Symmetry: C2
Subunit: 149 residues, 2 copies
Amino acid sequence: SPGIWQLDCTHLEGKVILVAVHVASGYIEAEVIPAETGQETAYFLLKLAGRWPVKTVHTDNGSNFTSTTVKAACWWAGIKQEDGIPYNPQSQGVIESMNKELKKIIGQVRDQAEHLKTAVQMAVFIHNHKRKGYSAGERIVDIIATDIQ
Amino acid sequence: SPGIWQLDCTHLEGKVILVAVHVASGYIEAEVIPAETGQETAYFLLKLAGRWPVKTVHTDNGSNFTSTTVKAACWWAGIKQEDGIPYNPQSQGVIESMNKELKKIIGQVRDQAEHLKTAVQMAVFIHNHKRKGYSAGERIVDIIATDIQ
Ligand SMILES: O=C(O)c1c(/C=C\c2ccccc2)ccc2c1OCO2
Ligand SMILES: O=C(O)c1c(/C=C\c2ccccc2)ccc2c1OCO2
């Protein structure tokens, strides 16, 4: 559980927002890319795994699951690549809810930034600091620290 | 101490590598940029502060310290912006040593990646996982978790 992440791809302003969610905490990292390719997804995962102890990734679709470049990145970074099929159906709804939330926050900051990528990073900040009480940022650190110890 | 980071700018292949080091752990995040501008530094700090609880940043030079855009990002993200003058002289040498180390790792992976940015992220991964025994990634999580609790 401490090492499990889920990929999520959502769209805004004709652009693609790639999101990784740490399933147990709700903590996220995200980037704007022009389109969701294996190459972009691979690079994103490499970045993520250098920054957090990523053991398992549930990929967001079959193209990324199949991608040789994504498989290469997962091999390189020691990530178990899995499918992202919601065997538990409450999963789709949770992802859907998070995308709606992220887009709402993006709307709330959009005028403070010229570029979408900046608004997305503001949204990441607000999401990860939001008190729900602990924040998602607090939860991920606590979860991982408990695991290490 | 849990919230203190140091900026570091180093050069390779006619490009600029911007690094943030969590001083107490040695954990890093890094990006390749075409040149070190206030705009790029501001965006980098926004990303960092959305991902870790960044309280204080020791800026890497006077241009970034002065930059209105960097100041705006620090204000937005709740970061205390400080100078990076090594009042303790062992600091320059530690930064210097880390840049040499990062470049060495980059050299060791450079042929596995077409693009420098990929090699830099491989270097981030290797650096943060390296056991010294705890890794820098383990140290940062432990330090922050102890603070939160
Ligand atoms: O306007 C932008 O999108 C933008 C900005 C602007 C505001 C801003 C950005 C971060 C925090 C507070 C304010 C700055 C750097 C950037 C930007 O784009 C990439 O690097
Ligand atoms: O060749 C690259 O630099 C490159 C690569 C290649 C290898 C690679 C990258 C990550 C992990 C293992 C292998 C892949 C995606 C990318 C890349 O550039 C941006 O997105």
